């Protein structure tokens, strides 16, 4: 047991209501402060089981992260509407994390381990250096998220400081990389002060134009390319992604990456997303069921599919109505051309929910 | 919300005490039955509640898996000592999962999502087929666990049936793969009815000798090669692995695989593992801190290390005393030869916790 003991809540009240009186003092009490902006719970007792148990989730995270200077608080959308408005808490059930001069919206799975992992990521520095062949291979292994890398001459470079300033705008959701090593820059085809932007799952980057780049030019570029043609659903941002629907629907692909059949389907999906990456109307959410075991039976029931096999369909975010590509079984996968044809009919509305 | 709605516990009592009077019926009710074998909780209310929250974890899992034929129950080590002995429940705080003729011990993180993911793995078939080049790439992509692959003529082969019987013995912890595809077999260098065993993180397999292989020969081989030179700690088996030290210590390497610094260290670690894989006294636990976020502050405090940098150290399993390889910072990583020398000093006893 010694060397491996999960923490058990100790009953100490660490998460309290944050109101117009105490909010100035709460902030001075923590290096990083995360505020859950919530609606007052319903008068019925069944909604209290959901509210108390989720405050206890924040209490566990508060306990785990105490010695790292993190604190958690609750902000009532009615009782505290005034202070909420001044702090910038506008989305009910989001958790706003305050680090330095940035406000980070958490809109992901409400679970202690996922919240703690997210705060640990927030506490890290917003730029990761790349030096040498091994660290470069590490950068190149990243595919399931947007990434940026820039080539500068040193930490003191004025353009590096603008890169770091832009990095803080998207922390911790978009990893920003910098290299001062010319051999790395050579392999990446980076001229000095050039910044390459890699859309998730794309092998070919786009250089931000008009080098060198100020913070404003980077922030503007990223905001314009924020939605990848193929996105992976991730627990830490699952509701942010799900709320970003394409005119009422999502195209959802289920594939277990480690399974031979899921891998085979996933390769086809990546290849089709790469070949159609310039289509502005095309977005696909890849869900690996192994990332969301507690939702697998729900999904199988709601969608009437077998998640032991790869699937792709259209999901309506209003009522969870759905239509799925017909496959005989896990061996009956579509070719890249059959997948494109199905995606084309979906986008033309010929395959509707 | 809609299409992305996590289940919340509904209050229905699905997990009950399983005892001499009802166990035969509980077993008959469920296709797959998971039994938590636990001591009676202490008389105070603090441990009485920690026991209730663990039962609520099983209640959520039971609710989520109800339609898949899975049930959960609780067996008291004192009140139900007799039925525990009858069923083979011996390790307090383990959960025993009954599928067909097998009894599968769960000794991993006690949380609803890890337990549900585990049971979903239990429900899967014990042998995965490989056909075609892309499924072969998927097989070759597996590295962080032991794996076996055999080449057979079809499922009607006696040797396939022996292989699937052996697979059931280790399900779901060691993935067994079968191919009937002679082109895949040629690419793997498998003769018909041969079985190759891949130790975790090793490029080159070991062929099980004395082809063709009975169930007993496969099981015996796997048991003798159960302990990889480099083993990744996983939530589903974390306590099983931690309780499996050889001599009183674990060599523990912390490395975040996705981080450039962790990756650089990890590649060195794998190289040293592969070069020293025949040393029977060498075994290293690789912990990726991102798999265990709720333990990261505790590890940092207990071990006096910074887990945003890679680390390797010796941990005594009796008193948690530890000693860590000294590194100036995350760039001061050892070479393969310096790691070897450090590991050699550990196994010689020069570097020790005492
Ligand atoms: Ca509280
Ligand atoms: Ca939201
Ligand atoms: Ca989890
Ligand atoms: Ca992390
Ligand atoms: Ca700055
Ligand atoms: Ca991140
Ligand atoms: Ca270029
Ligand atoms: Ca410019
Ligand atoms: Ca949001
Ligand atoms: Ca499969
Ligand atoms: Ca298959
Ligand atoms: Ca695109
Ligand atoms: Ca998982
Ligand atoms: Ca296939
Ligand atoms: Ca119960
Ligand atoms: Ca145990
Ligand atoms: Ca699984
Ligand atoms: Ca059999
Ligand atoms: Ca498994
Ligand atoms: Ca061979
Ligand atoms: Ca034989
Ligand atoms: Ca055990
Ligand atoms: Ca790093
Ligand atoms: Ca580095
Ligand atoms: Ca070995
Ligand atoms: Ca993680
Ligand atoms: Ca380095």
XYZ file of C-alpha atoms and ligand atoms in Angstrom:
734
model
C 0.000 0.000 0.000
C 2.852 2.361 0.910
C 3.654 4.500 -2.136
C 0.168 4.171 -3.681
C -2.780 5.615 -1.703
C -5.622 7.555 -3.348
C -6.806 10.538 -1.282
C -10.039 10.325 0.713
C -11.942 13.519 1.496
C -11.233 14.617 5.067
C -14.398 16.698 5.651
C -12.586 20.048 5.835
C -14.612 22.780 4.132
C -12.339 24.200 1.427
C -14.875 25.159 -1.282
C -17.119 28.060 -0.247
C -19.497 30.516 -1.882
C -17.734 33.444 -3.530
C -19.772 36.663 -3.336
C -19.283 40.418 -3.681
C -18.004 40.644 -0.087
C -15.273 37.983 0.064
C -14.181 37.624 -3.568
C -11.307 40.110 -3.252
C -9.931 38.130 -0.293
C -10.488 34.696 -1.861
C -8.345 35.731 -4.840
C -5.482 36.848 -2.578
C -5.626 33.453 -0.839
C -4.640 31.362 -3.894
C -2.145 31.367 -6.744
C -4.826 29.874 -9.061
C -8.569 30.158 -8.443
C -11.287 28.099 -10.150
C -14.902 29.265 -9.817
C -17.893 27.099 -10.730
C -20.585 29.422 -12.108
C -23.820 27.583 -11.302
C -27.545 28.105 -11.082
C -29.157 27.712 -7.654
C -30.277 24.092 -7.304
C -33.900 23.095 -7.678
C -36.107 22.931 -4.595
C -36.680 19.185 -5.022
C -34.423 16.850 -3.056
C -33.459 14.700 -6.068
C -31.580 17.681 -7.558
C -29.734 18.082 -4.243
C -28.154 14.645 -4.651
C -26.654 15.995 -7.882
C -25.547 19.284 -6.326
C -24.049 18.063 -3.052
C -22.179 15.214 -4.731
C -20.704 17.646 -7.252
C -19.649 20.135 -4.589
C -17.963 17.175 -2.907
C -16.130 16.528 -6.189
C -14.695 20.053 -6.004
C -13.879 19.477 -2.327
C -11.773 16.438 -3.223
C -9.922 18.386 -5.930
C -9.501 21.327 -3.542
C -7.924 18.983 -0.983
C -5.621 17.308 -3.511
C -4.413 20.622 -4.955
C -4.107 22.641 -1.708
C -0.286 22.465 -1.396
C -0.009 23.659 -5.008
C -1.849 26.893 -4.255
C -5.115 26.078 -6.088
C -8.497 26.959 -4.684
C -12.081 26.297 -5.733
C -15.200 28.402 -5.206
C -18.888 28.544 -6.087
C -20.632 31.567 -7.638
C -24.450 31.610 -7.620
C -25.904 32.910 -10.891
C -28.703 34.732 -9.005
C -27.368 35.592 -5.539
C -24.036 36.609 -7.077
C -25.033 37.908 -10.504
C -23.276 41.208 -9.808
C -19.862 39.747 -8.991
C -20.329 37.113 -11.698
C -20.797 39.890 -14.251
C -17.660 41.732 -13.136
C -15.473 38.599 -13.118
C -16.801 37.483 -16.515
C -18.662 34.298 -15.537
C -21.272 34.115 -18.308
C -21.844 30.388 -19.055
C -23.815 28.462 -16.440
C -22.080 25.219 -15.327
C -18.703 26.352 -16.644
C -15.741 26.589 -14.277
C -13.589 29.661 -14.787
C -9.930 29.243 -13.782
C -7.918 32.394 -12.960
C -4.175 32.186 -13.625
C -2.224 35.434 -13.793
C -3.990 37.746 -16.219
C -5.928 35.012 -18.036
C -9.328 33.438 -17.458
C -9.628 29.798 -18.582
C -13.075 28.292 -19.109
C -13.402 24.627 -18.121
C -16.338 22.937 -19.889
C -15.511 19.257 -19.507
C -16.323 16.111 -17.568
C -17.201 16.962 -13.964
C -14.999 14.422 -12.230
C -12.305 14.950 -9.613
C -9.549 13.193 -11.534
C -10.371 15.061 -14.758
C -10.590 18.416 -12.949
C -7.317 17.812 -11.090
C -5.528 16.793 -14.297
C -6.841 19.956 -15.949
C -5.575 22.203 -13.123
C -2.177 20.476 -13.182
C -2.068 21.309 -16.923
C -3.069 24.922 -16.183
C -0.226 25.231 -13.677
C 2.375 24.233 -16.301
C 4.165 26.839 -18.411
C 2.395 27.725 -21.677
C 5.373 27.085 -23.985
C 7.324 23.845 -24.329
C 10.828 24.060 -25.786
C 12.034 21.638 -28.460
C 15.742 20.785 -28.705
C 17.246 17.726 -30.372
C 15.990 14.767 -32.363
C 14.133 12.986 -29.542
C 12.152 16.028 -28.391
C 11.393 16.735 -32.054
C 10.011 13.234 -32.524
C 7.822 13.937 -29.475
C 6.458 17.088 -31.124
C 5.814 15.129 -34.306
C 3.959 12.358 -32.452
C 1.226 14.842 -31.462
C -1.731 14.406 -33.805
C -5.037 14.511 -31.890
C -4.970 18.248 -31.137
C -4.087 21.520 -32.847
C -0.442 22.437 -32.255
C 1.819 25.411 -33.114
C 5.630 25.532 -33.326
C 7.865 28.549 -33.893
C 11.573 29.051 -34.533
C 13.178 31.939 -32.614
C 16.730 32.857 -31.659
C 16.351 32.762 -27.881
C 14.062 33.279 -24.919
C 14.950 36.975 -25.084
C 13.746 37.262 -28.684
C 10.961 39.809 -28.842
C 9.047 37.483 -31.219
C 9.323 34.609 -28.732
C 7.791 36.820 -26.061
C 4.877 37.554 -28.405
C 4.556 33.799 -29.035
C 4.417 33.148 -25.295
C 1.828 35.915 -24.920
C -0.303 34.269 -27.613
C 0.277 30.887 -25.950
C -1.270 32.181 -22.723
C -4.455 33.067 -24.624
C -5.198 29.395 -25.368
C -3.648 27.621 -22.357
C -3.958 24.734 -21.748
C -6.025 23.671 -24.737
C -3.586 24.301 -27.593
C 0.065 23.285 -27.072
C 2.590 25.929 -28.153
C 6.136 24.789 -28.985
C 9.272 26.863 -29.589
C 12.730 25.828 -30.773
C 16.001 27.788 -30.707
C 17.855 24.918 -32.406
C 18.628 25.343 -36.109
C 18.792 21.591 -36.829
C 15.230 21.137 -35.554
C 14.112 24.221 -37.497
C 15.707 22.787 -40.639
C 13.732 19.561 -40.365
C 10.475 21.453 -39.784
C 11.182 23.880 -42.710
C 10.992 26.844 -40.333
C 12.761 30.060 -41.194
C 13.591 32.290 -38.255
C 10.422 33.743 -36.632
C 8.154 31.567 -38.785
C 5.327 29.815 -36.934
C 3.737 26.669 -38.332
C 0.159 25.754 -37.406
C -0.848 22.078 -37.526
C -4.554 21.377 -37.629
C -5.430 18.248 -35.654
C -4.672 15.092 -37.680
C -3.177 17.012 -40.616
C 0.335 16.182 -41.685
C 0.797 19.465 -43.589
C 1.067 22.693 -41.555
C 0.115 26.243 -42.496
C 2.601 29.022 -41.785
C 1.086 32.082 -40.171
C 1.537 34.818 -42.817
C 3.285 38.167 -42.453
C 6.235 37.083 -40.276
C 7.344 38.158 -37.849
C 4.122 37.785 -35.833
C 2.840 39.848 -32.927
C 0.549 38.322 -30.296
C -2.426 39.807 -32.131
C -1.522 38.194 -35.453
C -1.181 34.755 -33.801
C -4.348 35.002 -31.698
C -6.244 36.107 -34.810
C -4.836 33.258 -36.915
C -5.675 30.595 -34.315
C -9.187 31.959 -33.685
C -9.790 31.721 -37.426
C -8.582 28.093 -37.672
C -9.952 26.921 -34.333
C -12.268 24.144 -35.641
C -10.434 21.165 -37.145
C -11.979 19.034 -39.875
C -11.523 16.027 -37.560
C -11.724 16.546 -33.788
C -11.238 13.975 -31.029
C -13.703 14.198 -28.164
C -11.735 14.591 -24.926
C -13.064 14.412 -21.352
C -11.459 17.728 -20.363
C -13.339 19.611 -23.119
C -16.186 17.275 -24.063
C -19.055 19.725 -23.497
C -17.243 22.600 -25.190
C -16.828 20.372 -28.227
C -20.385 19.010 -28.089
C -21.910 22.494 -27.773
C -20.035 23.616 -30.927
C -22.503 21.923 -33.228
C -22.666 22.253 -37.028
C -26.172 23.654 -37.607
C -27.918 21.388 -35.110
C -25.999 18.167 -35.823
C -22.683 16.402 -35.339
C -21.148 13.786 -37.571
C -19.874 11.325 -34.945
C -17.414 8.518 -35.664
C -16.913 5.842 -33.005
C -13.638 3.931 -33.300
C -11.495 2.179 -30.702
C -7.971 3.135 -31.809
C -6.294 0.093 -30.196
C -8.709 -2.417 -31.720
C -7.695 -3.824 -35.134
C -11.092 -2.977 -36.660
C -11.270 0.461 -35.054
C -7.729 1.228 -36.204
C -8.570 0.202 -39.775
C -11.629 2.455 -39.845
C -9.748 5.286 -38.160
C -7.040 5.249 -40.869
C -9.747 5.658 -43.516
C -11.359 8.484 -41.555
C -8.045 10.336 -41.169
C -7.255 9.965 -44.866
C -10.677 11.302 -45.872
C -10.400 14.218 -43.439
C -7.015 15.082 -44.915
C -8.329 14.935 -48.506
C -11.319 17.136 -47.620
C -9.652 19.390 -45.052
C -10.486 22.548 -47.025
C -14.241 21.884 -47.006
C -15.527 24.520 -44.534
C -18.820 22.703 -43.909
C -17.188 19.399 -42.893
C -16.508 18.636 -39.251
C -16.361 15.165 -37.685
C -16.078 14.272 -33.996
C -14.066 11.101 -33.386
C -15.055 9.375 -30.127
C -12.903 6.523 -28.903
C -15.392 4.554 -26.712
C -12.551 3.453 -24.433
C -12.212 7.058 -23.306
C -15.854 7.149 -22.078
C -16.767 3.742 -20.609
C -19.571 5.192 -18.437
C -21.338 6.404 -21.632
C -20.966 3.230 -23.735
C -24.246 1.495 -22.741
C -26.104 4.829 -22.937
C -24.775 5.428 -26.446
C -25.559 1.902 -27.614
C -29.121 2.299 -26.333
C -29.715 5.867 -27.521
C -28.244 5.322 -30.994
C -29.109 1.607 -31.388
C -25.541 0.686 -32.356
C -22.948 -1.859 -31.261
C -19.917 0.032 -30.000
C -17.737 -3.052 -30.250
C -17.650 -2.171 -33.980
C -16.660 1.063 -35.771
C -19.565 3.411 -36.494
C -20.190 6.785 -38.141
C -23.462 8.660 -38.150
C -25.295 11.940 -37.776
C -26.446 12.968 -34.298
C -29.020 15.697 -33.675
C -28.049 17.684 -30.586
C -31.648 18.678 -29.758
C -33.111 15.233 -29.126
C -30.274 12.691 -29.758
C -31.998 11.398 -32.900
C -29.443 9.734 -35.137
C -28.815 7.893 -38.411
C -25.843 5.575 -38.899
C -23.865 4.272 -41.867
C -25.054 0.734 -42.611
C -22.304 -1.852 -42.120
C -22.923 -5.613 -41.991
C -20.367 -5.972 -39.180
C -16.907 -4.775 -38.096
C -15.381 -6.282 -41.247
C -17.758 -4.374 -43.577
C -15.871 -1.073 -43.387
C -16.268 1.540 -46.130
C -13.515 2.544 -48.483
C -12.289 6.124 -48.484
C -14.497 6.709 -51.530
C -17.585 5.141 -49.942
C -16.948 7.220 -46.810
C -16.656 10.459 -48.822
C -19.854 9.637 -50.732
C -21.687 9.075 -47.444
C -20.264 12.308 -46.003
C -21.256 14.163 -49.182
C -24.867 12.934 -48.966
C -24.928 13.938 -45.291
C -23.715 17.448 -46.121
C -26.221 17.735 -48.993
C -28.977 16.715 -46.580
C -29.668 13.573 -48.599
C -28.895 11.636 -45.376
C -30.857 13.487 -42.681
C -31.837 12.741 -39.092
C -26.703 16.876 -22.589
C -28.565 14.947 -25.300
C -26.322 12.253 -26.764
C -23.658 13.019 -24.138
C -25.443 12.420 -20.820
C -23.503 10.734 -18.011
C -25.622 8.336 -15.918
C -26.485 9.472 -12.392
C -27.348 6.973 -9.659
C -31.116 6.428 -9.495
C -31.302 4.996 -5.967
C -32.451 1.476 -6.838
C -30.595 -1.042 -4.668
C -28.966 -3.445 -7.138
C -25.877 -4.475 -5.126
C -26.641 -6.663 -2.113
C -24.835 -8.843 0.372
C -24.236 -12.287 -1.131
C -24.415 -15.082 1.441
C -25.042 -18.781 1.990
C -28.803 -18.318 1.663
C -28.971 -16.435 -1.665
C -25.701 -16.871 -3.569
C -26.926 -19.713 -5.780
C -29.787 -17.491 -6.918
C -27.637 -14.383 -7.363
C -25.347 -16.437 -9.608
C -28.374 -17.613 -11.568
C -29.683 -14.067 -12.024
C -26.623 -12.626 -13.796
C -24.666 -13.763 -16.815
C -21.550 -12.132 -15.313
C -21.243 -11.567 -11.566
C -18.675 -9.388 -9.776
C -18.226 -9.946 -6.021
C -16.383 -7.495 -3.802
C -14.722 -9.509 -1.022
C -14.348 -7.095 1.893
C -13.703 -7.083 5.608
C -16.476 -5.794 7.885
C -16.040 -2.027 8.252
C -14.921 -0.482 11.525
C -17.568 0.553 14.043
C -16.930 4.300 13.707
C -18.834 6.465 11.224
C -15.863 7.765 9.191
C -14.942 4.324 7.858
C -18.658 3.448 7.815
C -19.162 6.223 5.245
C -16.028 5.445 3.198
C -17.513 1.944 2.899
C -20.872 3.369 1.815
C -19.308 5.516 -0.917
C -17.482 2.464 -2.256
C -20.777 0.558 -2.358
C -22.314 3.513 -4.220
C -19.494 3.200 -6.751
C -20.611 -0.400 -7.329
C -24.242 0.757 -7.465
C -23.465 3.145 -10.324
C -21.526 0.434 -12.162
C -24.397 -2.012 -11.579
C -26.882 0.503 -12.947
C -24.730 1.258 -16.000
C -24.169 -2.415 -16.824
C -27.616 -3.773 -15.903
C -28.711 -4.342 -19.520
C -25.484 -6.208 -20.362
C -26.265 -8.954 -17.848
C -23.697 -7.896 -15.226
C -24.349 -7.931 -11.500
C -22.379 -6.812 -8.471
C -22.529 -8.070 -4.896
C -20.689 -7.848 -1.600
C -19.219 -10.787 0.348
C -18.297 -10.230 4.009
C -15.050 -11.943 5.002
C -16.418 -12.831 8.477
C -20.187 -13.128 8.129
C -19.793 -14.998 4.819
C -16.481 -16.793 5.421
C -17.919 -20.153 4.332
C -19.323 -19.110 0.965
C -16.152 -17.060 0.322
C -14.082 -20.225 0.781
C -16.492 -22.110 -1.489
C -16.241 -19.466 -4.221
C -12.492 -18.864 -3.963
C -12.566 -15.333 -2.508
C -9.272 -15.065 -0.643
C -7.790 -11.613 -1.144
C -9.619 -8.998 0.907
C -10.466 -5.839 -1.096
C -10.309 -7.681 -4.411
C -13.332 -7.939 -6.679
C -13.804 -11.384 -8.228
C -15.560 -11.526 -11.598
C -17.274 -14.765 -12.622
C -17.556 -15.311 -16.394
C -18.286 -18.806 -17.712
C -15.874 -21.159 -15.981
C -13.321 -18.461 -15.082
C -12.799 -16.390 -11.964
C -11.040 -13.084 -12.718
C -9.507 -11.112 -9.834
C -9.844 -7.328 -10.125
C -7.190 -5.553 -7.995
C -7.176 -2.043 -9.469
C -8.426 1.510 -9.007
C -11.799 1.510 -7.258
C -13.800 3.993 -9.306
C -16.923 3.563 -11.363
C -15.400 4.333 -14.751
C -12.384 2.020 -14.260
C -14.607 -0.807 -12.994
C -17.095 -0.384 -15.860
C -14.285 -0.284 -18.447
C -12.858 -3.442 -16.881
C -16.181 -5.321 -17.003
C -16.676 -4.217 -20.607
C -13.253 -5.757 -21.320
C -14.308 -8.937 -19.480
C -17.420 -9.199 -21.668
C -15.363 -9.103 -24.881
C -14.282 -12.355 -26.528
C -10.866 -13.628 -25.359
C -9.227 -13.907 -28.807
C -8.922 -11.101 -31.347
C -8.511 -12.135 -34.993
C -5.954 -10.492 -37.304
C -6.616 -10.369 -41.064
C -4.930 -8.154 -43.647
C -2.097 -5.648 -43.444
C -3.913 -2.868 -41.569
C -5.048 -5.141 -38.722
C -1.448 -6.394 -38.569
C -0.263 -2.795 -38.095
C -2.765 -2.477 -35.230
C -1.266 -5.583 -33.622
C 2.279 -4.260 -34.032
C 1.224 -0.921 -32.489
C 0.579 -2.663 -29.143
C 3.639 -2.280 -26.933
C 2.682 -1.437 -23.344
C 1.440 -4.936 -22.484
C 2.394 -8.563 -23.041
C 0.737 -9.990 -26.156
C 0.582 -13.355 -27.922
C -0.219 -14.187 -31.541
C -0.574 -17.597 -33.146
C -1.182 -18.812 -36.692
C -3.838 -21.495 -37.160
C -5.821 -22.934 -40.039
C -9.268 -21.901 -38.721
C -11.360 -21.852 -35.562
C -11.997 -25.575 -36.096
C -8.348 -26.370 -35.418
C -7.688 -28.180 -32.140
C -4.696 -25.885 -31.757
C -6.844 -22.781 -32.099
C -9.165 -24.203 -29.443
C -6.215 -24.831 -27.117
C -5.044 -21.250 -27.742
C -8.483 -19.848 -26.946
C -8.655 -21.983 -23.799
C -5.293 -20.540 -22.715
C -6.514 -17.016 -23.556
C -9.467 -17.458 -21.159
C -7.038 -18.139 -18.299
C -5.530 -14.640 -18.553
C -8.568 -12.683 -19.819
C -8.754 -9.748 -19.961
C -5.210 -8.789 -18.869
C -3.123 -10.344 -21.658
C -4.431 -9.912 -25.225
C -4.345 -13.098 -27.318
C -4.434 -12.713 -31.109
C -4.974 -15.368 -33.779
C -4.464 -15.157 -37.523
C -5.704 -17.568 -40.181
C -4.130 -15.339 -42.865
C -1.030 -16.937 -44.381
C 0.236 -13.558 -45.663
C 0.044 -12.072 -42.162
C 1.688 -15.231 -40.799
C 4.564 -14.914 -43.270
C 5.081 -11.284 -42.338
C 5.195 -12.356 -38.669
C 7.490 -15.354 -39.460
C 4.924 -17.742 -37.906
C 4.811 -21.324 -39.103
C 1.410 -22.976 -38.907
C 0.382 -23.599 -35.271
C 3.314 -21.537 -33.960
C 2.656 -18.934 -31.237
C 4.893 -15.906 -30.639
C 5.001 -14.232 -27.225
C 5.891 -10.520 -27.153
C 7.112 -9.262 -23.780
C 5.974 -5.690 -23.114
C 8.018 -3.028 -24.994
C 10.160 -5.702 -26.732
C 10.652 -5.703 -30.511
C 11.567 -9.352 -30.877
C 9.137 -12.066 -29.754
C 9.915 -15.410 -28.160
C 8.386 -18.415 -29.894
C 6.689 -20.879 -27.587
C 8.722 -24.094 -27.968
C 7.527 -27.585 -28.900
C 4.938 -26.541 -31.511
C 2.086 -27.401 -31.698
C 1.066 -26.270 -28.200
C -1.481 -27.706 -25.775
C -3.394 -25.366 -23.488
C -1.043 -26.444 -20.665
C 2.088 -25.589 -22.639
C 0.770 -22.108 -23.434
C -0.341 -21.415 -19.854
C 2.969 -22.686 -18.433
C 4.978 -20.531 -20.827
C 2.984 -17.380 -19.996
C 3.274 -17.967 -16.228
C 7.049 -18.388 -16.528
C 7.371 -15.158 -18.573
C 4.739 -13.183 -16.640
C 7.111 -10.447 -15.405
C 8.292 -8.028 -18.086
C 11.612 -6.174 -17.727
C 9.632 -2.932 -18.152
C 5.999 -2.816 -16.961
C 3.579 0.110 -17.281
C 1.441 0.823 -14.241
C -2.231 0.798 -15.182
C -5.286 1.850 -13.124
C -7.096 -1.454 -13.859
C -4.253 -3.477 -12.268
C -2.314 -0.974 -10.189
C -2.476 -2.834 -6.846
C -1.857 -6.240 -8.420
C 1.314 -4.815 -10.001
C 2.436 -2.907 -6.893
C 1.924 -5.993 -4.736
C 4.167 -7.955 -7.176
C 7.638 -6.795 -6.158
C 10.387 -9.372 -6.269
C 12.660 -8.621 -3.298
C 11.202 -5.731 -1.260
C 11.647 -2.788 -3.700
C 10.332 -1.475 -7.005
C 12.425 0.545 -9.429
C 9.950 3.215 -10.459
C 10.359 5.499 -13.481
C 8.077 8.529 -13.808
C 7.830 9.776 -17.391
C 5.018 11.644 -19.139
C 5.058 9.994 -22.577
C 3.499 12.942 -24.451
C 5.925 15.489 -22.962
C 9.183 15.980 -24.962
C 11.319 15.536 -21.830
C 9.344 12.500 -20.615
C 9.486 10.999 -24.102
C 13.264 11.482 -24.329
C 13.732 9.750 -20.979
C 11.218 7.049 -21.896
C 13.092 6.180 -25.104
C 16.314 5.690 -23.123
C 14.435 3.551 -20.601
C 13.029 1.322 -23.333
C 16.469 0.969 -24.952
C 18.041 -0.124 -21.665
C 15.130 -2.523 -21.016
C 15.542 -4.110 -24.443
C 19.337 -4.397 -24.101
C 19.030 -5.985 -20.659
C 15.829 -7.955 -21.115
C 17.470 -11.292 -20.218
C 18.503 -10.091 -16.753
C 16.083 -11.995 -14.466
C 16.643 -9.562 -11.590
C 15.769 -6.390 -13.566
C 12.212 -5.086 -13.583
C 11.099 -1.448 -13.752
C 7.629 0.031 -13.203
C 6.941 2.891 -15.615
C 4.357 5.330 -14.227
C 3.051 8.023 -16.570
C 1.848 10.723 -14.129
C -0.931 11.706 -16.488
C -2.611 8.345 -15.852
C -2.796 9.088 -12.096
C -3.508 12.810 -11.609
C -5.033 12.297 -8.126
C -1.757 10.756 -6.916
C 0.661 13.324 -8.369
C 0.765 15.732 -5.370
C 1.042 12.797 -2.940
C 3.963 11.282 -4.887
C 5.734 14.639 -5.080
C 5.378 15.121 -1.331
C 6.196 11.537 -0.283
C 9.160 11.067 -2.617
C 10.438 14.704 -2.636
C 10.534 14.913 -6.448
C 9.091 17.144 -9.168
C 6.828 15.116 -11.461
C 6.859 17.680 -14.245
C 10.358 16.246 -14.918
C 11.224 12.567 -15.544
C 12.539 10.640 -12.530
C 13.730 7.153 -11.702
C 14.191 5.789 -8.221
C 14.049 2.862 -5.827
C 10.936 2.563 -3.647
C 10.790 0.272 -0.622
C 7.368 -1.398 -0.567
C 7.309 -1.891 3.210
C 7.940 1.671 4.456
C 7.799 3.816 1.254
C 11.366 5.030 1.797
C 12.942 5.921 -1.535
C 16.116 7.168 -3.237
C 16.039 8.932 -6.606
C 18.560 9.343 -9.403
C 20.033 12.828 -8.984
C 19.366 15.126 -11.964
C 20.028 18.873 -12.131
C 16.818 19.413 -14.116
C 14.709 17.931 -16.905
C 17.559 18.400 -19.428
C 20.138 16.553 -17.280
C 18.861 13.120 -18.414
C 21.128 10.062 -18.210
C 22.511 8.330 -21.238
C 21.697 4.683 -21.796
C 25.073 3.766 -20.287
C 24.594 5.993 -17.233
C 21.122 4.543 -16.651
C 22.601 1.027 -16.907
C 25.301 1.895 -14.361
C 22.688 3.353 -12.001
C 20.441 0.268 -12.380
C 23.474 -1.984 -11.840
C 24.310 -0.166 -8.608
C 20.697 -0.602 -7.462
C 20.641 -4.351 -8.119
C 24.066 -4.702 -6.462
C 22.761 -2.879 -3.385
C 25.200 0.050 -3.639
C 22.219 2.379 -4.136
C 19.658 1.474 -1.484
C 16.928 3.039 0.600
C 18.451 1.886 3.918
Ca -17.995 23.483 0.920
Ca -21.259 24.397 -21.519
Ca -11.341 8.581 -14.496
Ca -1.140 16.558 -18.206
Ca 4.145 38.009 -20.917
Ca -3.554 20.407 -22.920
Ca 8.061 25.925 -44.145
Ca 3.664 40.778 -38.563
Ca -18.396 26.713 -23.095
Ca -12.367 -6.029 -32.787
Ca -11.241 -7.805 -37.445
Ca -9.413 21.711 -42.212
Ca -9.953 4.228 -20.874
Ca -10.896 -5.775 -40.648
Ca -26.860 -1.782 -2.076
Ca -4.625 -6.477 -3.406
Ca -11.540 -1.502 -23.349
Ca -13.077 -23.721 -25.095
Ca -7.081 -5.829 -21.497
Ca 9.274 -16.974 -36.323
Ca 3.750 -29.520 -27.884
Ca -4.149 -9.508 -5.998
Ca 8.432 19.346 -20.515
Ca 13.185 19.930 -23.011
Ca 12.747 -9.548 -20.193
Ca -4.875 11.416 -18.223
Ca 15.989 17.228 -23.572
